[PDB]
Amino acid sequence: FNNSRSDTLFLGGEKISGDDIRNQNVLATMAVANVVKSSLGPVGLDKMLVDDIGDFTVTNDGATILSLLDVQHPAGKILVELAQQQDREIGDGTTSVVIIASELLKRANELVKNKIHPTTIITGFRVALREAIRFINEVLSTSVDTLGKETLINIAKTSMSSKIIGADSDFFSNMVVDALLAVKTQNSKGEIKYPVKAVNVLKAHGKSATESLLVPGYALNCTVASQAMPKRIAGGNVKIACLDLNLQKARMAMGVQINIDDPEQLEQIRKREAGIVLERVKKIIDAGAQVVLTTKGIDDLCLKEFVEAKIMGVRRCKKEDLRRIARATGATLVSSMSNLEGEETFESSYLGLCDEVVQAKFSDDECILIKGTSKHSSSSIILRGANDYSLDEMERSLHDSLSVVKRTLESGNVVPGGGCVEAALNIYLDNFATTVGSREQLAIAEFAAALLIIPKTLAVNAAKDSSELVAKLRSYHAASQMAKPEDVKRRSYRNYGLDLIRGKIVDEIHAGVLEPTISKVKSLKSALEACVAILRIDTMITV
Template sequence: MSMVYDEYGRPFIILKEQQAKARVKGDEAVRSNILAARSISSLLRTSLGPKGLDKMLVSPDGDVSITNDGATILEQLQIDHPVAKLMVELSQSQDDEIGDGTTGVVVLAGSLLEQAENLLKKGIHPVRIAEGFEKAASVAIQTLGSIAETMDIQANDHQALKTTAQTTLSSKILQSHKNKMADIAVSAVLRVADLERKDVNFERIRVEGKTGGSLEDTELVSGIVIDKEISHPQMPKVIQDAKICILTCPFEPPKPKTKHKLDITSPEAYEELYNHEQSYFRNMVKAVKDTGANLVICQWGFDDEANHLLLQNDLPAVRWVGGVEIEHIAMVTGGRIVPRFEQVSAEKLGTAKTVREVQMGNERMLLIEHPMHTSAVTVLCRGGSHMVVEEGKRSLHDAMCVVRNLIRDNRVVYGGGSAELACALAVEQYADTVTGVDQYAVRAFADALEDLPLALAENAGYRPIEEVAAAKAKQVAENNPYIGIGVSSVDAPRNGHAMDMREVGVFETLIGKQQQIQLAAQVVKMILKIDDVIAQGQYQ
């Protein structure tokens, strides 16, 4: 600190290295990191399960989103704390790999950190806590594998796939229409799936939304849906056995890239210019017609003159199609994208059985149905508002991801918190065999696993501790790892909501549940081992 004087002789103080306070270390850093991560977890806790609540997110631009998808909520939050960003990445990793369980993985990580904080207060070193959590996580993952059931996904008209999709949709906005939506999700995945290789190409599935109608009007289209229309009202609206020319060059004369000036001083000069332009247009139309194409899809626009010539030559066209749609059309129809008219040829055309324009409300859309080259589907989601449509698209995507996961690995565990309770009991038994300080961390891991069914019961309006205790005791008494909390039941039985989830028919994929525990344990271990936070450029 030093004192200086300004030009009027007034003293003022200069504080040196005042930004060195940006460093946090020791127990203070660990507790600060745990607090930041738990704040994110507590935000998502109320969104967990079939009775979870939605969040309204308002962006700085005023855009409003309503969702209970964990990855979407965290993605749109403006977070500055570096450890809180780890929780966002945790949810995003679950979404990228599995597509579902994005809320549960964050809630589990928050519960583990809460238990870790209690152990830190008892004087246990963070490294010992992380090692105990790691041992317990491996036991929980092995337990999930032992209680998992192998499903015949092709039996009873793929009933196992539909039930799994219904379980996913139970916590979404599509809950009231989950039977139909589950059928749509399963049909969409099966049409593009290779069951022998256990592979699903999601690039062949598009999810489009259109405001208007209700969620019940959502449909599955065998092909591609484009939010465009035929460029001229007098062109045919239905093209059978379509041969599609896909252009990324404009239907217009080339424009000089330098400054130019054109002086027309006589009617003859204007007529000559008009004929030259017409000749250029006719040559472009002739080049396309000679290939046998009966439909042109152009990434760029073309003026009314070119549109009129296309009509005269019986060549329907669609203009201003986006680059992503152009690539998808080329992929599924087997066509090649043509960047200039000199390269147009018959072997570069895409093929589809039918291309038709349909009316939806006050707008029109183009349907490319039954492409000849490969299978492709589009789920057209309808809704009364833009927010409903966007949330419906997210819900359907999650359902299709779960169906994809069950095709990859057809083993399932049962929901309602039954899998977590079974793992908690197994971890508690394992803790009895552990000696030393690690057993405290192992038992804490078991307590954290019970937090997920606690949140399910709490969000459903039940008495969480009583319900979880009853389900846990019933699992032990009956030696049945499938006892969970029936949060979807209307009337509570006399002995509470604890029931066999096999009778309820609530499935979750094994790989999704194992991924949750594995990712949560890894992130918690990373957070616990951070004991020094240094802001770059602020501390020397």
């Protein structure tokens, strides 16, 4: 099998055209797709990538595998650029994009052999695509199913199953979800997004792991500067002054020696050095700041006034924690005072407007908890465990679990995965084809069938018999797609997918197998474009 020595089109080069190049188009795109086929899904297998020097790496990342894939035939380079567009726009799914594109091209060649002109295949595929996206819009949903049941628990419980914290996952899976649900924010103009960083995590060795604490607001890893300060202050309405600038007796200069000879100078120096910070305290008290959090520390004279005023002053704060309190409470940090060369703490602008701040005892540890405030989208978790060594691993797992759940929640519109989209489109589009009765009926049918390569590949990679796993999907989805077109229902059970671990068909919505809709819409659209780009090439000339 080869093509050369055309000895025609008298040119300084080769000519390959017709069925010859079309056969190469199929072989090339299959050869590339086979590279990533075996890695599809969390149960797939990895491969070694060997360079030209003598080194290699092992990975199952489709983006890395395709990036390091040596592609010679131009027909396969179409799939390389296909993947690059997916990686730049979406950043994931490139494996399924290449796999579908190859299956579309292969089947397209069969249509050509059956006397279906490539122009009618290209059009028919695009007709199926436009309808396929309309279908997905009727399947997708927003973040739902949190009343009487919760699907995010299956997300969190899965993510932590690899970590020490998973031993108590039936408890901690709720800590992950309940915490993250509390920190939904709006950013600007109603984005409705979860922060990339949220849910401050502390630790304590006080009690058993199942006694970990869920705090409705921010937990500050500090205590009151003085044990004489209240542990519960201003339950009605409390203000937090978050400062960086010090309240430690001022130094006039680090490089100047002060030499005091005149008793009058003693008064001038003593009052000035203390006055700088004591006058600031007066402004902190007058602004209502019954909680005062300073990064660079507070002097003892300054603390005394705070104690007498029943103000929960704190010294040696971590600036990062104050940025979290300030932002969460609507405030900005006092890094300096100005406002036309004056001095103030900027009441209601640099002070947080909170409901109540307390200091809590965690059985041989302590911290300050902020319960509520006008508008924050903040929360904190304090993990407990066997010891500090286990607490480190538990914290690391919580950070991982929150990231996994967040990624799912970040996509305002999600559609079940596991083959739900491809299997559902297979049946729906097959019915669509019956409304044509010309040429596109065949292109639509083959387009629909091509999508089954995904649930088929997933089943094979799971070591399960695809002839049962995929066939069962067609049965379950057919039931939903036989009822759907009649608009007759009372209860409608759809979106069945592959459980690639146990080897059974499950309801993916409750199981929690979700993929962003933007991934599925752009993955399906992109896969067609590569198929068309290859199918349009019936001639290659090499000079």
